[PDB]
Ligand binder design. Structure first.
Ligand SMILES: [Ba+2]
Lengths: 153, 185
């Protein structure tokens, strides 16, 4: 098994790739039968400060997991923010990006959010310019939208 | 020939309606609904919509009726379809669906040369209403009539104003227009 790890040998490693080698649209995402994956709904702007999504993907690629036990990760959010962020994510295998918005339902249907194992709702937008009760509008709206959605059994 | 172009203006502030028509006499404490541009159907401001919040509280069937009148459809099923983010979709429809192509629509008719033009001269509103309802299945809402009384000479300001449900003894004129609710396309 030609597996490529880090120099320290504690994480899975892949050679560097351009962003478009992982970029996908709705048709391609629905073509791939994603299941038991992880969905990251990112509410980021184009000039918002970085979160460091590496720290979210690094623990998921530990070397004590068999390569078939790795959980695919798909990030749904803004694209320019992901252009900035991709410099630190290109070395993690089994990672996909679907540009768009997480509040749209077509994206969530293509991603197969009803077969996933976890949906992490993160927001990179700037904080505290308005009432403190109106800083988590996007997160609450996304949670309610996902809860109220209905799929086909 | 450029003063006969029918145009409707949308205003941000409702106090600017004094600058739209020249032949009218302006006044600073007159309400928007009483000015001449609004009475003719030329100016429109969103402030008149501020009264739609109270009526919907007092009458729960008002909003449904007004949406049905001024939208031509938009059933909750269409809202659900649009809520999926995929946009408007459709194509050739089954004959059962195409039965929705017969709802009534608001239209405007004239008393000049139509089959019911006999009410233009000496006719009364009630006679025209009952005749249209009995014969053509048409319900009349109101009149849209020249502002100048001397329509024989047709004074240069050829503007019209609206009368809502005139009494049964209202006298008609050959140049009047009627708002109607037509059926069967
Ligand atoms: Ba004036």
């Amino acid at each position: 098994e030609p597996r490529k790890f880090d120099s320290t040998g504690m994480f899975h490693w892949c050679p560097d790739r351009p962003l478009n080698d992982c970029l996908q649209d709705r048709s391609q995402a629905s073509a791939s039968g994603l299941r038991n994956h992880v969905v990251v709904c990112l509410f980021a702007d184009a000039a918002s400060p970085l979160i460091g999504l590496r720290n979210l993907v690094m623990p998921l690629r530990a070397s004590n997991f068999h390569y078939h036990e790795l959980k695919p990760t798909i990030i749904v959010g803004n694209l320019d923010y992901l252009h900035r962020e991709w410099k630190t994510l290109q070395n993690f295998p089994k990672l996909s990006i679907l540009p768009g918005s997480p509040l749209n339902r077509a994206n969530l249907r293509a991603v197969n959010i009803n077969l996933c194992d976890m949906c992490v709702i993160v927001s990179a937008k700037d904080r505290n310019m308005e009432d403190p009760n109106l800083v988590d509008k996007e997160a609450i709206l996304c949670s309610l939208n996902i809860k109220a959605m209905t799929f086909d059994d | 020939a450029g003063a006969n172009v029918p145009l409707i203006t949308e205003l941000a502030n409702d106090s600017n309606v004094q600058f739209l028509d020249q032949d009218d006499d302006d006044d600073p404490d007159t309400e928007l609904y009483m000015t001449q541009p609004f009475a003719c159907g030329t100016a429109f401001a969103v402030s008149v919509l501020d009264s739609l919040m109270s009526t919907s509280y007092f009458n729960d069937n008002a909003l449904t009726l007004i949406r049905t009148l001024i939208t031509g459809g938009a059933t909750p099923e269409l809202e659900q379809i649009l809520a999926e983010g995929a946009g408007m979709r459709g194509g050739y429809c089954s004959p059962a669906v195409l039965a929705n192509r017969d709802r009534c629509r608001v239209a405007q008719i004239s008393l000049f040369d139509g089959p019911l033009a006999q009410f233009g001269q000496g006719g009364h509103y009630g006679e025209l209403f009952v005749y249209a309802l009995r014969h053509f299945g048409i319900l009349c809402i109101g009149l849209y009539r020249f502002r100048d009384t001397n329509e024989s000479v047709r004074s240069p300001s050829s503007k019209r104003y609206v009368i809502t449900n005139p009494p049964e003894d209202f006298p008609l004129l050959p140049t009047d227009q009627v708002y109607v609710l037509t059926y069967k396309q």
